[PDB]
Amino acid sequence: MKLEQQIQRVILEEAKALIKDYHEYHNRVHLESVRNKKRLGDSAPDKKIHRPNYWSFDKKFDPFYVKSNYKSIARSIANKIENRTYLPNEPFTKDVPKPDGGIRKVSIYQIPDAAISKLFFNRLLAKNRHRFSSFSYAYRNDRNVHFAIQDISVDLKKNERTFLAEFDFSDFFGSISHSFLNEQFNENGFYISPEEKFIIRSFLRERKVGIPQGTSISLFLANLTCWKLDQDLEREGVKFSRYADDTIIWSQEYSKICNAFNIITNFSKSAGIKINPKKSEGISLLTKKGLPSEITSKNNLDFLGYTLSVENVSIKEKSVKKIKKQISYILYRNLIQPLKKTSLAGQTIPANDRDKNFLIAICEIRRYMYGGLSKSQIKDYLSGRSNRLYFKGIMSFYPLVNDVEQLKQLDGWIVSVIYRALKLRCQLLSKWGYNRSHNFPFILDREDIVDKCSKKTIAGRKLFEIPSFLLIHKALQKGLQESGIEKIMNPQSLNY
Amino acid sequence: MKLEQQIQRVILEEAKALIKDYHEYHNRVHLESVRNKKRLGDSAPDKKIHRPNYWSFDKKFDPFYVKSNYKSIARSIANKIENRTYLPNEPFTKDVPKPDGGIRKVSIYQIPDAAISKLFFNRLLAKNRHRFSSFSYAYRNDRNVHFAIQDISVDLKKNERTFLAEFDFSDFFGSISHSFLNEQFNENGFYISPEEKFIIRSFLRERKVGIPQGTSISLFLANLTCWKLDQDLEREGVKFSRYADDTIIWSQEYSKICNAFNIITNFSKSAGIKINPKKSEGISLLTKKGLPSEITSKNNLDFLGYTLSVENVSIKEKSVKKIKKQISYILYRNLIQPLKKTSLAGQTIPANDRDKNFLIAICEIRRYMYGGLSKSQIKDYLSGRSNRLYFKGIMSFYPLVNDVEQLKQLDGWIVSVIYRALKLRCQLLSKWGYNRSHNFPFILDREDIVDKCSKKTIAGRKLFEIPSFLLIHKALQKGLQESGIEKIMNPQSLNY
RNA sequence: CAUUCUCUCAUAGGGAUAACGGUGUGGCCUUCUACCUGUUAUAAUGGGUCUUCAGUUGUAAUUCGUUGCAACUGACGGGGGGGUGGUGUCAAAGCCGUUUCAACCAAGUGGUAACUUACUUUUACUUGGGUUUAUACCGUGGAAAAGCCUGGGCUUUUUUGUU
RNA sequence: CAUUCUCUCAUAGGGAUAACGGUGUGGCCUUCUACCUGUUAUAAUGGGUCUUCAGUUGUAAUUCGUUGCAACUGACGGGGGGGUGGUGUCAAAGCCGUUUCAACCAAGUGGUAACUUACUACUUGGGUUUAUACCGUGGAAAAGCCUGGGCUUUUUUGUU
DNA sequence: AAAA
DNA sequence: AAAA
Ligand SMILES: Nc1ncnc2c1ncn2[C@H]1C[C@H](O)[C@@H](COP(=O)(O)OP(=O)(O)OP(=O)(O)O)O1
Ligand SMILES: Nc1ncnc2c1ncn2[C@H]1C[C@H](O)[C@@H](COP(=O)(O)OP(=O)(O)OP(=O)(O)O)O1
Ligand SMILES: [Mg+2]
Ligand SMILES: [Mg+2]
Ligand SMILES: [Mg+2]
Ligand SMILES: [Mg+2]
């Protein structure tokens, strides 16, 4: 019957997706193990395949078991739903690390219950997304974080003095009152069928306050919870952009922003979600770099991996530190770490001006940021010689960055760190009894690294060119002007 | 070539759609001719197949010719586009009747140019719809008039006294300055590639002011033109809803609505689209039925076939008159009009309490409003006995009507008109020499028509039941609750 | 000037091809209808019944938000013109009847009929999806007849292929 | 406790099952290119070159928005510590060099190392099959334990 | 998920 | 197209 077929399809698709993910995981683990043995030699550890721990907690957690008998599970689920007796099995909750705020309580529901929640979340979103505020970029399938950043950037660039108000909700998911939620079902012209309402209440039955964490239906519940707040902020005339609990409000008038503060306070008192004074920065005044300000002032704001100023959009400083950590660790892992072991048995010592480890490190760096694109391909796309270019790297997560200066500094940092890591590798090789300072990768000065590396050619391709952020940024700008926000983050589903 | 394949696909799809429409048209004409001959007897006119006149104006207008050689057309179009020399051919402009405002000039572009406009409109909308205001419901794949009506109804029901202003632009499409349009291309973070910009300018080259009327790129340009107006209205805090030129702005404060008037005036002065004094009602005050008012007051407002009051949503009076005209003409055509001819040769005369013409008229009426649904099916859906119901009738164009009293009056009108038309048919039959007043369809009183017609059964089905608006309205409400607005009018596209 | 296939100097021009595309009805599969009752060895099949909403009562749960069940009550087919009765008041209005006229707009017009391949125009749609017997459509093929020009061509009917 | 197929009392329980699912590389088709130069009867293949942005100049169209073309100019790889020189000043700051240290965080810490299956969102344009090879389960061999057949560990084969 |  |  209709519901049972839908549940069958959803459960089968979810189980097959999980199985494909596991197979990719173990295949790439084997491949990386082969590469690691080619890297550390005799000191390389053995391949270790981890099945997820909770698969042993219950059979329905296992994708393989669910795929084994999914028709029976779907039949039983449909029968229980039609009898109004269905209740999701309790999830496996683990302490996901949140050192910024202590610890966070995540939950992994069983595959059938997670599939049911996903299906009903899809239905509810489909029939109700026209009622959600257009500034609700939280989750959804029509709104992205990048749309919010574009909106904020354009509006900030329009004027010169803006009043900000950044607020976070302390444990937003875990402190939603159930009375408020049940009162919200008959408001704003929401269309929730009795089956969907019963399912929603079923997912809230175990707890007495707040919505479960880590399941799809909670996303729709969170979006629906902040509808009166969104309407009030809109009718105040302030501009805002909410993403889950993270909210940023900016207006040109102090009175409007004070009223927005009062509105959020009233909404919190109505729904029981208090604001943590720590993460909430309060009311500020976003000016230009050197404009005098009469109240508390800041020259830039941070919003979901972007540091937004009046003039330009730039990568968040913490995200820049993450990028630096990843690149530096790639260099250390492929250049220095193998040489710090007790023995170098089974390792290929660079010779004849052929350091394969340097080539591997450069290729992996290019994969990290470009995604494997050569400079020739990017330049061809920029010139218009070609029309196809795929964007999947660290930059595809920040398509709207227009801060060329920050990317210039990042490129300089990359070159300098490459030079210093090469110097350390040469020193370690000398300490190990190999003089290689006159060979190709080590004899290069910092100034001449980029030029000589670009000139270098292997197998008819330039695999040694040092990747640059500015080039991929130019490609990103052209791709935005020809494809659109959707295409840039098309593969990269902003799940953060 | 990527562009040429896209153009080929679009042109082929458009031509095939037009060919399918034509074949449906002539098959339907033949079937209706057979039925008409079975109705009018020897006085029935002969079948007349009309190919559209403009197909002879140029071969590219003909879907058959385009489908003949579409690869060549697409190749030439792509070559001309990439040479920046492409220019759409002159459309066929005809005087579509607009007696409300005199006449209107619509344009039918050639199939290749129309296909190119549709393709580039799809692209531009896809990469820019996230910048359009959520309150613009015209020419979108995510918005439609019913979302606007739902929003207006909910907001009106929230309060009791609302200040609203209604404005129509005198000639929205034909009086848009091209300087303003070309200035709008670099605003609001719009992503328009140089190719799309060139195409847009190509479609505007023939005229010196205003956008064409009959293409899709004109629809996108109309949406893009009113972006500053939408942003200004949103920043004022007024809640508005725009559908093409028809704009409705309602707020709880007089000052906000006066500022909205000033904003629209400034936008008109900036874009050259002067408002229409006759069509624009100006600033009013929407109260309840008997609440005293201090300024010009109205109890209900009209917006795209809906008459919206504070309490309930009802069909527009002109649309109700259209429904009455259609139903009454169905009755007159199947009952009275054949009997007004000079001779009754070849016409079946009712006998043995079997009026096939009455059955045909009732079935056609049911097709008009229900779409062919029996009362049993609708009652089964309402009870929950069944889960599948299809909504395609006159009611599917007004899914949000919650005025049960108006539908009750319409049902009474239907029954009374059926009774009176049957009486006239009996009188005409008597005048023609046939006494049938004692037979089934005519002996019925007005009170007993519905009951006995429901009891009547032919071929194991109740094809004689008089259709009722209230039942299909209940089905519409349940369908809105279960499936949502998009699915209810999914087949019944109410766009324009 | 095949609406089919193909070629190219490719939004145009050649070639050969007689099918190309589409409709109503029916069969098969696939869901999708509670109950009652016809006919057969228990399944087809035929004839019927009900489904909704609101309130109250009682009842069973509820994680107390809410929900199910049972019984009653109520709602569930317009308006206008004319005649007339009862009720209502001091007299009315009003309310409740009953009779008569009508295709609708028209509860209207200075006036009142027509129309659906219509009308205007924000304005307008037809059966749940595939699978093939018979019916049959647009245009193009051919076979016949006719009526014109020329001495083969044009036009009109019929037939056949698509079928 | 096949992750395969099938049955049902169907979010659980049976049956037989030897394949099931997936990865890297290659081939093939189909696109995503300009230019110069190697080799062959004119096409493959090998090796190189450039592509961007802004301004100015002049030119050609423009439906006056703008666009094209040509030539120049300019931009196009961070920061910190130490030494040192020149410039700058009344003296400085500052600016311009040059030299040296460092894997990154670190322009930092009370202190400086480690780490990627980590910590707290991604890996090559899409299908099509030679060889490589993975998870889990069957098999066949060996071994090491219990029992007198079972358990555990390795090797081989089917997927392949 | 609209032009024409 | 949307989370564990
Ligand atoms: N990566 C994540 N994926 C999904 N949900 C997340 C993630 N991180 C946090 N959440 C949850 C926790 C919150 O309910 C909400 C995001 O809020 P967050 O900014 O983490 O602060 P918080 O609500 O935990 O506040 P506090 O730390 O003060 O309790 O979604
Ligand atoms: N049926 C239609 N199809 C396409 N465009 C239309 C249609 N009707 C109107 N338009 C155009 C005209 C306007 O620019 C806009 C809609 O305007 P509309 O509300 O019909 O009034 P209008 O602006 O034409 O007033 P007027 O009749 O006085 O000229 O789209
Ligand atoms: Mg928070
Ligand atoms: Mg108008
Ligand atoms: Mg009348
Ligand atoms: Mg350091």
B136 in reach of chain A (CB within 8 A): no
**Residue type present at position B309:** S
What's the A274 CA to ligand 3 centre distance in angstroms?
8
The answer to whether A238 touches A264, Cβ cutoff 8 Å, is: no
Whether residue B59 contacts residue B65, with contact meaning beta carbons closer than 8 Å, is answered with: yes
Q: Is the CB of B259 under 6 A from ligand 2?
A: no
Q: Which residues surround ligand 4, an ion (CB under 5 A)?
A: B 168-169, 245, 276
Query: Which structural technique was applied?
Result: cryo-EM
Resolution to 1 decimal place, in Å = 3.5
CA torsion angle B249 B255 B261 B263 (round to 10):
-100
Q: H or E element: which one contains A298?
A: strand A297-298
Distance of alpha carbon B121 from alpha carbon B140, whole angstroms: 10
**CA–CA distance, B52 with B349 (Å, rounded to integer):** 38
Contact A191/B at CB under 8 A = yes
Taking the CA of residue B436 as centre, how many other CA atoms within 13 Å lie in the half-sphere pointing to its CB? 23
Q: Are the C-beta atoms of B49 and B29 separated by less than 8 Å?
A: yes
Nearest CA to ligand 1 atom 20: A171
* The residue count for chain A: 496
- Which candidate in A127, A137, A256 is best for mutational testing of the B interface (most B CBs within 10 A)? A127
Out of B142, B191, B236, name the one closest to residue A142 (CB): B142
Contact between the CB of A139 and strand F at under 7 Å: yes
Cβ neighbors of A38 (< 8 A, separation 6 or more) are A348
Q: Which atom of ligand 1 is nearest to the CA of A174?
A: 14
Q: Within window 43-62 on A, which residues have Cβ closer than 7 Å to strand D?
A: 47-50, 59-60
B-chain CB neighbours of A485 within 8 Å are 127, 130, 191
Element (H, E) at B248: strand B246-251
By C-alpha distance, which of B473, B493, B478, B492 is closest to B388? B478
Give one DSSP letter per residue of B325-388, joined into a string: HHHHHHHIIIIIGGGGSS--TTPPPPBTTB-HHHHHHHHHHHHHHTSS--HHHHHHHHHTS---
Å from CA of A277 to ligand 3 middle: 10
**How far apart (Å, rounded) are the C-alpha atoms in residues A138 and B134?**
16
> What single-letter amino acid sits at A227?
W
Instruction: Provide the residue type at A235 as one letter.
Output: R
C-alpha span between A293 and A299 (Å, rounded): 10
Does the annotation place B172 within a ligand binding site? yes
Of how many residues is chain B composed? 496
- Residue A169 counted as an annotated binding residue: yes
Which H/E stretch holds residue A369? Answer: helix A356-369
**Positions of strand C less than 7 angstroms from a protein CB:** 2-8, 10-13, 21-24, 31-34, 46-53, 63-67, 76-79, 102-107, 114-128, 136-139
DSSP SS3 for B73 = helix
> With an 8 Å Cβ cutoff, are A480 and B143 in contact?
no
φ, ψ dihedrals at B145, nearest 5°: -65, -30
Closest Cα partner for A401 from A480, A285, A288? A480
> Residue A283 — φ and ψ, nearest 5°?
-90, 125
Q: Whose CA is nearest to atom 22 of ligand 1?
A: A171
* CA distances (Å), origin B211, targets B126, B127, B191, B222, B272: 20, 21, 20, 8, 12
Strand partners, B249: B165, B240
- A172 in a known ligand binding site: yes
| Nearest CA-CA partner of B203 in B330, B282, B113, B141 | B113
Measured between CA atoms, the residue of chain B closest to residue A239 is: B235
Query: Tokens standing for A413?
Result: 């940092």
B408 known member of a binding site:
no
Q: Give helix B111-128 / helix B217-225 axis angle, nearest 10°.
A: 40
CA of B457, C1' of C133: distance in angstroms: 30
User: B239 vs A235: CB contact, 8 Å cut-off?
Assistant: yes
Atom of ligand 2 nearest to the CA of B172: 14
What separation in angstroms does the CA of A73 have from each of A64, A119, A198?
13, 15, 19
Q: In which element (H, E) is residue B222 found?
A: helix B217-225
- Check if the beta carbon of residue A242 is closer than 8 Å to that of residue A137: yes
**CA distance linking residue B317 with residue B410, whole number of Å:** 12
> DSSP of A257-287, one letter per residue?
HHHHHHHHHHHHHHHT-PBPTTT--EEEEE-
* Pocket of ligand 1 contains residue A58 by CB under 6 Å: no
Q: For chain A, say whether B483 makes contact (Cβ under 8 Å).
A: yes
Which H/E stretch holds residue B271?
helix B254-271
Neighbours of A321 (CB within 10 A): 11
Which chain A residues have a beta carbon less than 8 Å from that of B191? Answer: 480-481, 484-485
DSSP tag of A61: G
Mark yes or no for CB contact B484/A127 under 8 Å.
yes
- B245 CB less than 6 Å from ligand 2? yes
Name residue, tokens 């079923």: A202
Distance B419 CA to ligand 6 centre (A): 97
The set of residues, in sequence order, having a beta carbon less than 8 Å from that of A246 and lying 6+ positions away, is A166, A168, A303, A304
Give the Cα separation of B486 and A14 in Å (integer): 27
Which nucleotide lies closest to A418 by the C1' atom and the CA atom?
D103
Report the separation in Å between the CA atom of B468 and the middle of ligand 3, taken as the mean of its atom positions. Answer: 53
**CB proximity list for A192: less than 8 A, separation 6 or greater:** A124, A128, A185, A200, B481
Query: Residue A244's closest CA among A188, A177, A317, A171?
Result: A171
Do strands A92-97 and A162-167 pair parallel, antiparallel, or not at all (unpaired)? unpaired
Given a contact cutoff of 8 angstroms between Cβ atoms, the answer to whether B166 and B280 are in contact is yes
Breaks (C-N over 2.5 A) in chain B follow: none
Phi and psi angles of residue A32, each rounded to the nearest 5 degrees, phi first = -65, -30
- A255 interfaces chain B, CB cutoff of 8 Å: no
Q: Per the structure block, which two tokens stand in for B219?
A: 């629809």
From the list A48, A61, A51, A49, the residue with the least C-alpha distance to A93 is A61
Phi then psi for residue B424, to 5 deg, are: -65, -40
A301 strand-pairing partners: A308
Asked whether the beta carbons of residue B130 and residue A188 sit closer than 8 angstroms, the reply is no
CA B339/CA B341 separation, integer angstroms: 6
CA dist B75 and B61 (Å) reads 18
User: Is the CB of residue A228 less than 8 Å away from at least one CB of chain B?
Assistant: no
Ligand 2 center from residue A424 Cα (angstroms): 74
Contacts of A126 in chain B (CB under 8 A): 484, 486
Tokens standing for residue A295: 């109240």
What is the rounded CA–CA span in Å between residue A197 and residue A123? 12
Calpha distance A441→A448 (Å, rounded): 11
Angle between helices B254-271 and B228-236 (to 10 degrees): 170
- Closest residue by Cα to atom 30, ligand 2, is B173
Q: What ligand has the least distance to the C-alpha of B104?
A: 2
Among B307, B311, B320, B472, CA closest to B396: B472
Q: Which residues contact A108 (CB under 8 A, 6 or more apart)?
A: A54, A61, A91, A92, A93, A94, A114, A214
3-state secondary structure of B313: strand
- The angle at the Cα of B425, spanning B421 to B430, to the nearest 5 degrees, equals 150
Q: How far is the CA of A111 from the C1' of D16 (A)?
A: 28
Sign, CA torsion B249/B253/B256/B262: positive
Can you tell me the distance from the alpha carbon of B227 to that of B245, in angstroms, rounded to the nearest whole number? 13
Please give the structure tokens belonging to residue A280: 């909430």
* CB of A495 closer than 8 Å to CB of A138: no
What's the token pair of residue A67? 């795929």
In this complex, which residue's CA is closest to the C1' atom of nucleotide D124? A372
- The answer to whether A234 contacts B235, with C-beta atoms less than 8 Å apart, is no
Residues 6+ apart with CB under 8 A from A455: none
Sign of CA dihedral B371, B375, B381, B382: positive
Distance of alpha carbon B189 from alpha carbon B191, whole angstroms: 6
Type and span of the H or E element at A248: strand A246-251
Q: Which two tokens stand for residue B475?
A: 């089905």
Query: Contacts by B122-125 with C-beta closer than 8 Å and gap 24+?
Result: B122/B216, B123/B196, B124/B192, B124/B196, B124/B217, B124/B220, B125/B220, B125/B223
From residue B386, alpha-carbon distances to A7, B94, B383, B389 in Å are 19, 48, 8, 8
In the reported structure, the alpha carbon of residue A338 is separated from the centroid of ligand 6 by a whole-number distance in angstroms of 21
